[PDB]
Amino acid sequence: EVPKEKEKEKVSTAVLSITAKAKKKEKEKEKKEEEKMEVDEAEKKEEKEKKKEPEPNFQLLDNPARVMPAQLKVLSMTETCRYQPFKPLSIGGIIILKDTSEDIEELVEPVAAHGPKIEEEEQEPEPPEPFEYIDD
């Protein structure tokens, strides 16, 4: 994470602790009939996030695979499911017939581009993007 963004959070944290502790410690109240204690010390700390794990996944080796039987669907041209190589069983799941793309070539499923017959059934639209030609 960017150094500048986190530097803001640390600075903020440090100012509240030092300023509050400065007044709190010096005040005199114990001797007084007010009794809020002559010393009161003031520390606040920050925390940083840790690695996220939403719903369990199965981890074996360094992981050239990592699966769970409970499925979610994700869009094409949006692999945000950042696959490990050699998982054929997770791409297309075990072959789709819930989608426009119906397999007529069975369990061939590379982790790269799989586009079987889109004419068998229609369960959803399919915008063409000329974007790859543009880049070209």
Binding site: E26, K32, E33
Partner: protein
């Protein structure tokens, strides 16, 4: 050990009975709790009655035994049984008498544990019982004084039964005023002054006072017990907050003044700073006490005793108020008025001038800068007044020949030398006005105001001459009238004084450095009283700060003046405040913290907290640095809480200066200069050793200005044998020379360190306490945070007046002389229950008088035990007087 035993008739088995509840009693625990409820009342009376007799006998017997560690937990467990259903549930007539030894069970616990938390707790439980007993407590204390079988413990412990009263859970007037407080005070100086302070039982004591005096005389030492109650009240500021606290200080002042022993009363009045309090002191003491005693005379004397600042009688808010009080008080109009009037204290000063002589080496060396420096030195040798009169009277030599700033400054300082003259100082002033440049003339006006103060009570006063002067156009002549008016009066709440300040003070920045002093002077008028205010000072202060603060000396005076003016209570202030509030500055913010202190009419708990959330060691250029140094010193605070608490506070103040110095590179040089002024204000425990130690290091180190400030306080004792120390210090001063600029600072330092023989050093506290307060010393201090001095700067420093009147012996009842008194010497210190410590004489002879000096002569005491009398006024001579109180209208003490 033996179980029970307060169920067995012999008086011997009572002693194991006290230990016994640790195991438990055989019949005695069940009799009180279980059997009392379970079984019928009439039947129980048999069992109880046999137990009552023993329980009572046992109370004197327990006190007779000496354990407090075996005694204390055993009787404490038994206490729970009595509380259950023997407190007042048993029957109506039987419990009242049963509660009488019950009181005893608790008392040992109350006594052993002498903290304040145990005191409190112990009180809550005891007060309810008191109310139930309905006067069995007063009788109980009486038996104890007699001692049937007692012979030790009962002296600390019985006081605790009185301690129990304070809480007043259910006690109206069922024992709150008189319950033998007077024997209890007489024997025990410790525990009762605390009980006394809080309760306001102290009021009853006034009624008692004649009777109490008899015990005070030479049978017992009650005098010590009275002296103690003031120590606790000043300390009580920190204990319990100031708003809760102000009513308590006020309550003790009424009782102390009425009761004859004035020195404790003055300490509280001085702290309050109001108009009402001062008139009262004269009238109260007269009416309660039917005999004339010391009591009539005290009303005058208390004014004299009090040391605030400047001119004689000091505060002189009180002296201006006295003119018709003096009339009521009556021990002779003519006499009372002549002594009270500053003519008498002035008169003794004159007689002293002949023996005193001049012990330094004069100089009025004509022409150049040398002339201007020399004029300064004249005042400095005395550090006040002595036999300089001869030198000063010739106008021609010093004053006329002086050039530029030197004329104003020399002329300004001239009034401060000539104070302690009634006339013949004045003639010199009148002449100088006539001659030469505007400068001599301007400094002369201020000079007139000070001299004329030597006679007042509407006997030719300062106001009459100064009023005409106030109109003058020149900024120097204006400053002289207004500064002279705050110096002379040093407290005023007369209409005429306040109205004159009202349209002047139109200044807010001027070329002349001395013009800033006008603010201090307006604040000076406020002090010692409640608010009428003068609008002009208040308006100009905020404006000045934003406008200029570059001239550090100029800058210091204006916020200080603003706080001092606010001081006291009233609704006059409310109106001007709205006007002041509409403007808000960062600049105004510090001035405001000082005002909080001022407003309340003296604070010390509010002041305390504020000094933690401080303005100390803070600047942005010199924006917040205006009040920062003044605050750090916390001299006002040190003196305010007891003489005992002061010792510690003083060490901390020093430590604090050191702390400001570490923080700021600039602050280090200032922190050195600050020490002479701090020491000077404070009336420290570290008195002789410290300024001298610094002074030597400072020769070797650069900055001659350090020596010059250090020297004011370092002069210390005046020659008796102190000559050896002064001459050595002086030698170091002389030797050094390397420039004229350098030379001027040293030259002043040499002559200040020297003192003429049997004069006195500085004092700002009343001389039986370390509590005081001046406003006079803030001025030299402010202009000596600079590097070097100037001709201009030099003129402010020349004053150190708030010094003694030459009486430190027999103020007396038909004496009022310079002439000595019998004294005896003791190296002893056994007391801790005196206003600043005073030992008991063994009556062995030594050379007449206690030292006229501002230090020393403190263990050297009065003998008034071949006179068979007790001193009200404790012997010291720091400013103190040796006078004694008899029933007789006059002290029949011996002279020598």
């Amino acid at each position: 050990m033996e179980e029970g035993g307060r169920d067995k008739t012999p008086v011997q088995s009572q002693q194991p009975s006290a230990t016994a509840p640790s195991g438990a009693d055989e019949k005695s625990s069940g009799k009180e709790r279980r059997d009392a409820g379970e079984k019928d009342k009439e039947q129980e009376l048999s069992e109880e009655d046999k137990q009552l007799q023993d329980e009572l006998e046992m109370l004197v017997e327990r006190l007779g035994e000496k354990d407090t560690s075996l005694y204390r937990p055993a009787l404490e467990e038994l206490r729970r049984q009595i509380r259950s259903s023997t407190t007042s549930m048993t029957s109506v007539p039987k419990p009242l008498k049963f509660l009488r030894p019950h009181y005893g069970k608790l008392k040992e616990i109350y006594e052993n544990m002498a903290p304040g938390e145990n005191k409190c707790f112990a009180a809550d439980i005891i007060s309810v019982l008191a109310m139930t007993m309905s006067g069995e407590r007063e009788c109980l204390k009486y038996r104890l004084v007699g001692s049937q079988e007692e012979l030790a413990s009962w002296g600390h412990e019985y006081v605790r039964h009185l301690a129990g009263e304070v809480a007043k859970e259910w006690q109206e007037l069922d024992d709150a005023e008189k319950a033998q407080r007077e024997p209890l005070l007489t024997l025990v100086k410790e525990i009762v002054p605390y009980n006394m302070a809080h309760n306001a039982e102290h009021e009853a004591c006034d009624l008692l006072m004649e009777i109490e005096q008899v015990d005070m005389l030479e049978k017992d030492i009650d005098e010590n017990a009275y002296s103690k109650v003031c120590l606790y009240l000043t300390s009580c500021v920190n204990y319990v907050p100031e708003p809760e606290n102000s009513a308590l200080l006020r309550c003790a002042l009424g009782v102390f003044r009425k009761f004859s022993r004035f020195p404790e009363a003055l300490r509280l009045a001085l702290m309050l700073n109001d108009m009402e309090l001062v008139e009262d002191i004269f009238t109260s003491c007269k009416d309660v006490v039917v005999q004339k005693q010391m009591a009539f005379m005290l009303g005058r004397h208390g004014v004299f005793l009090e040391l605030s600042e400047d001119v004689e009688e000091y505060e002189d808010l009180t002296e201006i108020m006295s003119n018709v009080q003096l009339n009521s008080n009556f021990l002779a109009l003519a006499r009372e008025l002549d002594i009270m009037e500053p003519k008498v204290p002035d008169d003794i000063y004159k007689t002293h001038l002949e023996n005193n002589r001049f012990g330094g080496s004069g100089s009025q060396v004509d022409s150049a800068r040398m002339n201007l420096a020399s004029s300064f030195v004249n005042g400095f040798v005395n550090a006040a007044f002595g036999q300089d009169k001869l030198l000063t009277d010739d106008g021609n030599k010093w004053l006329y020949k002086n050039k530029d700033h030197g004329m104003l400054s020399a002329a300004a300082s001239l009034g401060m030398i000539l104070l302690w003259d009634v006339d013949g100082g004045l003639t010199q002033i009148d002449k100088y006005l006539y001659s030469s440049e505007d400068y001599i003339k301007s400094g002369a006006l201020l000079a007139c105001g000070i001299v004329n103060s030597g006679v007042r009570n509407e006997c030719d006063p300062a106001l009459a001459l100064l009023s005409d002067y106030v109109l003058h156009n020149s900024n120097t002549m204006r400053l002289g009238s207004i500064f002279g008016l705050g110096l002379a009066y040093a407290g005023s709440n007369r209409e005429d004084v306040l109205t004159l300040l009202l349209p002047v003070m139109g200044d807010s920045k001027s070329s002349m450095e001395v013009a800033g002093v006008t603010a201090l002077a307006c604040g000076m008028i406020a002090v010692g009283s409640c608010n009428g205010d003068v609008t002009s000072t208040i308006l100009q202060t905020i404006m000045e700060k934003s406008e200029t603060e570059l001239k550090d000396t100029y800058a210091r005076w204006l916020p200080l003046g603003l706080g001092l003016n606010h001081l006291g209570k009233g609704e006059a202030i409310e109106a001007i405040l709205a006007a002041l509030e509409v403007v808000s500055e960062p600049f105004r913010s510090f001035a405001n913290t000082l005002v909080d202190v001022c407003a309340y009419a003296g604070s010390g708990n509010v002041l305390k907290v504020q000094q933690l959330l401080h303005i100390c060691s803070e600047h942005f250029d010199s924006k917040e640095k205006e009040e920062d140094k003044d605050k750090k010193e916390k001299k006002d605070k040190d003196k305010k809480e007891a003489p005992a608490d002061m010792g510690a506070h003083q060490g901390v103040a020093v430590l604090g200066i050191a702390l400001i110095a570490m923080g700021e590179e600039i602050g280090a040089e200032m922190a050195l200069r600050t020490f002479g002024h701090l020491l000077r204000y404070g009336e420290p425990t570290l008195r002789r050793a410290v300024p001298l130690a610094l002074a030597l290091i400072s020769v070797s180190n650069p900055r001659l200005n350090i020596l010059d400030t250090l020297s004011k306080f370092s002069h210390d004792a005046d020659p008796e044998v102190s000559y050896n120390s002064i001459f050595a210090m002086g030698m170091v001063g002389s030797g050094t020379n390397n420039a004229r600029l350098a030379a001027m600072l040293r030259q002043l330092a040499q002559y200040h360190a020297k003192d003429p023989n049997n004069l006195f050093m500085v004092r700002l506290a009343q001389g039986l306490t370390h509590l005081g307060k001046g406003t006079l010393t803030l001025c030299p201090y402010h202009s000596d945070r600079q590097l070097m001095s100037q001709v201009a700067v030099a003129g402010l420093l020349t004053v150190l007046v708030s010094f003694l009147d030459v009486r430190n012996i027999i103020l007396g009842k038909s004496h009022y002389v310079l002439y000595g008194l019998v004294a005896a010497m003791q190296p002893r210190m056994l007391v801790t229950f005196d206003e600043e410590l005073r030992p008991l004489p063994v009556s062995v002879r030594v050379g007449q008088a206690v030292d006229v000096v501002g230090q020393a002569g403190k263990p050297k005491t009065i003998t008034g035990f071949q006179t068979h009398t007790t001193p009200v006024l404790l012997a010291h001579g720091e400013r103190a007087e040796l006078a004694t109180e008899e029933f007789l209208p006059v002290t029949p003490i011996l002279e020598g």
